[PDB]
Amino acid sequence: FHEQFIVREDLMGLAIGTHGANIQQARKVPGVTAIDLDEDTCTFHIYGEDQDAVKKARSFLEFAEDVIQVPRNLVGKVIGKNGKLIQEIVDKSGVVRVRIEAENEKNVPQEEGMVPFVFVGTKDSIANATVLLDYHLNYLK
Ligand SMILES: [Mg+2]
Helix, strand or coil: CCCEEEEHHHHHHHCHHHHHHHHHHHHHCCEEEEEEEEECCCEEEEEEEEEEHHHHHHHCCEEEEEEEEHHHHHHHHHHHHHHHHHHHHHHCCCCCCCCCCCCCCCCCCCCCCCEEEEEEEEEEHHHHHHHHHHHHHHHHH
């Protein structure tokens, strides 16, 4: 069992972690045979005995910067009082950071009626953040 994914080069220090701390975790996953980074393509290859093990290792390393578009009319539901809810969401989810971006009205490329929330984190952490977003946006009354 072998999987491969690309981690953008500016996120590489998150994937590897301070003195390899993060990649060390992915390596010590039982069942993982090997993890190799092809630095000229920023591609991790993870080799291992079962799929679950290789996926568990991918889980630590698969950093991304993904944009979620949040309806402007609902933005406050996700930010909270005392910017506290958005901080809890980042903290619970496990993401590294969210940037909420307000672009000048002249800036043409904008989904209409939307505020970009740009998360940096593992794919799984962003998935966690997304459920909490949707919960506060659409569900919670
Ligand atoms: Mg390089």
